[PDB]
Amino acid sequence: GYDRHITIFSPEGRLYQVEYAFKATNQTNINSLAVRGKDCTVVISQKKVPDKLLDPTTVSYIFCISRTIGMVVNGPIPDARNAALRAKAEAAEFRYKYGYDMPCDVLAKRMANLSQIYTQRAYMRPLGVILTFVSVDEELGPSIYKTDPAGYYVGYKATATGPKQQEITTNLENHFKKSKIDHINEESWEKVVEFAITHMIDALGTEFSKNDLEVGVATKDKFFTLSAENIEERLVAIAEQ
Amino acid sequence: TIAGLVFQDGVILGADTRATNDSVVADKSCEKIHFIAPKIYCCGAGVAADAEAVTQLIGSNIELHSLYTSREPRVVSALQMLKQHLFKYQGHIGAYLIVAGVDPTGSHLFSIHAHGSTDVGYYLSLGSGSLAAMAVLESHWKQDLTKEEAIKLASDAIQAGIWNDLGSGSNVDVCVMEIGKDAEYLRNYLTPNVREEKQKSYKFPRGTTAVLKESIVNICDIQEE
Amino acid sequence: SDPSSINGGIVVAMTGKDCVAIACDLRLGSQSLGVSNKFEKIFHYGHVFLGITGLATDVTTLNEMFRYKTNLYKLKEERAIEPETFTQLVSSSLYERRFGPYFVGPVVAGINSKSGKPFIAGFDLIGCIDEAKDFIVSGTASDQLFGMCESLYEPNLEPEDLFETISQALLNAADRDALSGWGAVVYIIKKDEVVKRYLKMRQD
Amino acid sequence: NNYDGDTVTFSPTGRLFQVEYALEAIKQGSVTVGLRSNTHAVLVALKRNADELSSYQKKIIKCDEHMGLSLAGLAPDARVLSNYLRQQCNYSSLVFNRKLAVERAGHLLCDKAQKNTQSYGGRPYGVGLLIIGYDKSGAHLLEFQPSGNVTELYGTAIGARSQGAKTYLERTLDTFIKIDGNPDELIKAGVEAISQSLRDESLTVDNLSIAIVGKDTPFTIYDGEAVAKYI
Amino acid sequence: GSRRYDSRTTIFSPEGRLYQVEYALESISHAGTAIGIMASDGIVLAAERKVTSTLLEQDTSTEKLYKLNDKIAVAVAGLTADAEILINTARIHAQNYLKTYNEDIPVEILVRRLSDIKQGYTQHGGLRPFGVSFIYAGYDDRYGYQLYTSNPSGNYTGWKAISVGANTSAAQTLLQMDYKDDMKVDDAIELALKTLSKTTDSSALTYDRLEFATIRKGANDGEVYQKIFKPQEIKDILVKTGIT
Amino acid sequence: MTDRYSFSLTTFSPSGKLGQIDYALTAVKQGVTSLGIKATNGVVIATEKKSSSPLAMSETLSKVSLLTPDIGAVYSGMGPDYRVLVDKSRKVAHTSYKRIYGEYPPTKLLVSEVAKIMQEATQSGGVRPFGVSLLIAGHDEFNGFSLYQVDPSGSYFPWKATAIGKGSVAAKTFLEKRWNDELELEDAIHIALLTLKESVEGEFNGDTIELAIIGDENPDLLGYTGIPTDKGPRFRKLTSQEINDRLEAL
Amino acid sequence: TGYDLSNSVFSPDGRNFQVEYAVKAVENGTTSIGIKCNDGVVFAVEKLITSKLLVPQKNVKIQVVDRHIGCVYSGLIPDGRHLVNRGREEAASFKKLYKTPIPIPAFADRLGQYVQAHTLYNSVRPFGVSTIFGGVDKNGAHLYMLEPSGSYWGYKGAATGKGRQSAKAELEKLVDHHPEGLSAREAVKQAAKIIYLAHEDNKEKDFELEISWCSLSETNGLHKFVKGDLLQEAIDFAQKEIN
């Protein structure tokens, strides 16, 4: 069964190495959630520090790709970091060649074209990661574009990745059935972060301390991550209402 | 003689229609305002093939890029790609270019030199007629020109070129790129140089020319049974 | 030393009413020495005519190059190339040698077999297209051809009138050039007919 | 088993069998011994012949005027690595006008072996080396194994029945380390050592190869009648 | 390394056969039959289309009969995409010969070069051979009218009449029975159709199932004409011979 | 990169089958239904937008792609394989044609270049075939309207109408009943929409259906005036609304 | 099965078995540790004395990158020398262009990306080492550890090789009993203790203690080996604690 060792077709028409790469995605046992405001895009991800020897400040699956673009990974860190460096390089090269900031959705297409090549080139193994790219695009506005080992990408109103994605997915699908709109109707990112955390607590049925969470916010003309203290500020606000 | 200037809600390009070989006129009706994208145009001066080839190359790539990114192409993109390509060839592609257009960022006007230098401006002229044109533009350009004003000033800048510069002549081509409108290309916008009726007809009495031999040429594929 | 004036030669192309004409001299020399009085500069691929003046080794090379490309074109497209399309192929092909050019002055003539529209063009040695409505000139007596054409020419000449005009353009321009003449050829081209005439000119 | 087809494959216990089989060619190779004092370093080598018509395989190569090795295993591999060391000694001289440190020779050999143990197509080197040298920090003896592992020792032995000599040196450590400014007594101590690794055959005149280097001694090889003194 | 996954497309069997050539020949055995017949005054190419559908656009369709220049055509049997790669090579090689010598390439020189490309893929490179067999129909002024065949091995031979694809055994017996040397194009047309009409695995042989072509020195004033028959003309020659 | 895979990964098996082409054609079958119908005065290509999540914005994923102003593509099989074939197909229309002749390639020749790209993925070292069948509809001055099918092998065929993927056997029978040589483009969009309802389980509206045409020239879509010979793209993606209008009269 | 015969192949679980096997080569190695102190980092390592014939203090294991970075590793020693060689190229090239000495995070990813590249292809073998490294940059002290997968995180303390479980247990106590931080001269002593303690797992052969350190106050933020009086003071402290 060498049709199961490299990226050639099984008799069924399947690429098993692509399928097994999707399963590496979940190895970290971390759940990620992205939602859009009017003005912003918020990505939350679980942060587990099991070892008391680890420097918790160095444990992250959220990457600042460019000034505009943030990227959360669901997968093992080495494949995550491989993809981060590449996206960063491709983003800076785009700006040099074409005289404008690489849009979130074009980066995602570029990174998904690279992924597709690893599913047709036998010498290259697919990355075991799902890349969630977020910006406030100067044309399309708040944006979420996700990439997988198959070389598939699509735009999202909101999305979730990880072991317990389906629970988070149906929670958000239920909310967008009530509001009937494409985004969280909220002026301040501070209240779209609060929303995202609140709907992750409901869906996963778990509470969160400042250290159990990792947040990314994309406003117009910058992407940034929240410190532990900034999250705590958010947690307080959810509790007091 | 090529020029461009900005007005209230857009940018305009002007060019003469003369091509020279040493001191003779090779062409009296050539188009110096080249298409890059639907709403991005490029005036060409310098080596004619070089200006024609570099605008077609970048215009081809801008189309592939527009398709790839599913976006209207930007002027700063055409600017960067022309300028990086001219720079690579160290002047040997002897193209002098005025780039203008509308994109989602607004309206833009840039000049590009053969060695790969770019300039930003509200009014620009290039080529042998550029000093004639720049004198008119420096006399009459103000902020918030209307379109009727803009087209008058641009066409006056090219006329300065036509009359006063031997390198420039024949007709005025113009291209208007207003925000939220279709760019309009106005080839032979002015025709101020129509050859006067000849004194005589030089049409010869038939048989005037001595002919040694005749023959039919076979241009069809396969004469068949 | 100047490649464009070692061998000599001229080509002139004119449009008429539902016709085009292309004509050339027959001289090939090594400067002052005349060598061949049979060197034709007008070639055709299907119904598209190409005259070429300049360095004779490039005249021959480019003909062999455009027979090759137009043959393949026809085998894939399943149709003869048209004058508009062939003109672009010539320009492409000249500009691809930008920094090592062929030393030629090409001239395309023909009628679009679909539209029936007469078409001529000329080129600099690096592919800049001049698409004239009236006439194109090329070669060592180009100045002399410009003068003759710009005076003699008038639009919408019948086939047998345009023959007389174009012949008189070439013959009188060749006679004021040391490196052109020695005989000449004129192609009268109609949509489904093509006459070729050898002109009796002075042999100096 | 299924993990011995090439040098790019790890075994389930974290082993490189291709390397371990290269290591094995060393054990099948004829014994050689190295040892040093503060003043001199000595190679003694038991050379092997095919039969009684044949010559004895040379086991000692000179690398520069202050450094050379003895080989056990594939000779052609020893040639490649000795050629490489010759060039590294030679580069140091020509560019920096500087005698290559024996510890730096060790590191260069360790990194050349290692490339063959991680990259497909290539094979490990099938040979072990004992490098001796005198440099700016006195007397040195290295042991090279083709895994890449290189070790600075007072004394060692490699090849068939090398465990004999190595135990002798392990006992004599306090005695032979003090043999300063007496090359003949240091060579004796090595000849005696290599004897512990003999069975049936005994040291003859065209059997025994010795090399020495030290304070005022260039690297020089004694064969044939030049080693009779020591039998 | 990657050695584990190499099929080794360019080795001998213990019997001294090239597996991949043989299995390609097996593939080509299942392809629609193509027949070539050479006469004194011309050459016939007939071929059977494999994919019958009522909704296939037939008049713009080419799977079997291609043109290499004005004097040389091929009929394909095998993977059409593989044949199209080789066809484009052959087209260029004839036009490099024309640019070098100022003469149309002799038929044999073109066929040897294609056949040399095919040979290449069987002896070096480790790629799969081209799953294609060609009948070559051509004219030149040295040998006149010529048929040749090539196959994945790179072997080529010349024939008075030949078949490739399905049922060549049956096809070759029927040709050998009815073919005579003093034969003419009109007869060779009738022989070619009759032979497909017998060997075909289809219930009946119809215009929508065929590609058909001729090479005649029966052009005006002793020239050479390649005629790729349009579907209507095939349906006419099917009535004329008496098969429909 | 130490790409040692210089040998074919597609080889003949003893039966004469090319395994990887067959398995790619199996991936095509499992793919959502797409179809093309050629009218006298245009061509229609149509597919279902099978949305992987209701949180996905299916507008951002186009299954129907413009290749040139006058040529359009749709597929059944692996989307990402289609996407890179679209990128390659657009570029080759420029590099091997537009930069030479100053016009866009005719439909057959652009098809021919895509075919070639896929034939290479079937024979080159260290690659699997493309897991897609394309339908390519175009216009060109001298051939008129055309519809082409391209298979993982490199093989292409001209069709009056066809379907590929999931229910293509049923869809192809449906079309064989309904097709004639006197269809107008509006008659072809009607038959396209009918045919595609048979293979669709769920919602059937303008938001779950992607339909495009090769029709008349759209000078209004051009973006610029003053060039009499550029008369505008013949390729047009129908809008969510335009589809729903035709579904009321269905 | 067969999933483990080729590097870069995913098993149906989503695992790369060759990388997991590389880890067994690492677990086989001698014990190495790192300790993050107030202003710097300390690296210690167990060196097994196979034979009396090994010259003391002469087979040095801890390798310096640039002037400010210390690297120690457990497992296949030549794999660790191959990585550091690459490290030295990365830090040179970075200094050449950007002038400043490479920051410890920048350096950590440079190794990270290289080790991860040796899991992407069947034509290469994964690295057979875990690497503990760190130094002092403009933002302060930094300690990292880099597994055969290319995985790496910041640590308060790190440990790998055969004595890792023992070391980690002892490192956690230090973290828990010194929240305000550990001084450089304190960490050196603790490093000696933790290597000795973790020498019960490798107890058959006797060993040689090797310590290095970078400290803003004690070495001017440069990497130095701990030699002479300071080394013996640490060895004596450790010898007193095991008794």
Place this chain on the structure above:
Amino acid sequence: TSIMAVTFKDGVILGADSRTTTGAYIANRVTDKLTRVHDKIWCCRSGSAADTQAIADIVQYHLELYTSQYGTPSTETAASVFKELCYENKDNLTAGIIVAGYDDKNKGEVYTIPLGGSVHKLPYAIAGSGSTFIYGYCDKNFRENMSKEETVDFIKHSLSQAIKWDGSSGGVIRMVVLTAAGVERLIFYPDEYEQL
């Protein structure tokens, strides 16, 4: 061209005239010669316009990729990349670049990269054809730890003398102020500076 940068108490100020010339013809009279390679690292350009644009572009690319990976690069690091390009392509470049930027650690810093592709860290720097006329003036009048208003005056006076005597300089005097406060662009027209 006339260009300078001056360190003062609060940060640094970049100054330049606006004249671009093709011989004696003024090709552009409102040129912006102050170019951003990062938020608070700017350079002054002199030499071949093509050459220095191509260089500043590559440097902006490099510092943007730097920021993605390692965060905010020091002014020194921007100087080092300019130098690397200038020095290694010295046989094909006519570029004379002044680099000036603000950190909170280092505060205001000026580096000059003359035609050698050498690097020099200076309290102030003058360059361009117009700089020869104001060595005397600037050496006499420069002090360390000037206020913002003093440093605007020093540059306005200095570039004013440079413009008066250099035919290749002229137009408006553009400045860029670089402090913890951020990034303030200034412009001074002829009718102000000429009459100084």
